[PDB]
């Protein structure tokens, strides 16, 4: 038989296609921003404001805003108001 040698160096085995976020973020931190200065605001005029606020960059949709406030309620970050749900209240 014959063993015999190679050329061996090359095993990192990298790829970095996905290392940290933002577009998943930026639109979290404009409605705590809006909340903190107008604290009461509604569903709608919450989402045309950061939906507006958001357009230099991209074009963000109520979608992920709605989803991100969802998740800011559930973490004593926001609030619902006992009389419609559609109005938001800061709580954080």
């Known amino acids: 038989m014959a063993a015999k040698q190679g050329e061996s160096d090359p095993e990192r085995k990298?790829?970095?296609?996905?290392?940290?976020?933002d577009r998943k973020h930026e639109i979290e931190?404009?409605?705590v921003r809006i909340?903190?200065?107008?604290?009461k605001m509604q569903?709608?005029?919450l989402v045309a404001e950061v939906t507006q606020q958001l357009k230099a960059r991209f074009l963000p949709s109520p979608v992920v805003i709605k989803k991100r406030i969802e998740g800011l309620i559930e973490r004593e970050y926001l609030?619902?108001?006992?009389?419609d749900r559609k109005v938001y209240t800061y709580v954080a």
């Not at 909340?35 to 604290?39: A, D, E, G, L």
């Open 35 to 39: 909340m903190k200065s107008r604290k």
């Open 14 to 21: 990298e790829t970095r296609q996905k290392v940290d976020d």
């Open 79 to 83: 609030a619902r108001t006992p009389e």
């Open 29 to 31: 931190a404009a409605i």
């Open 43 to 45: 569903h709608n005029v």
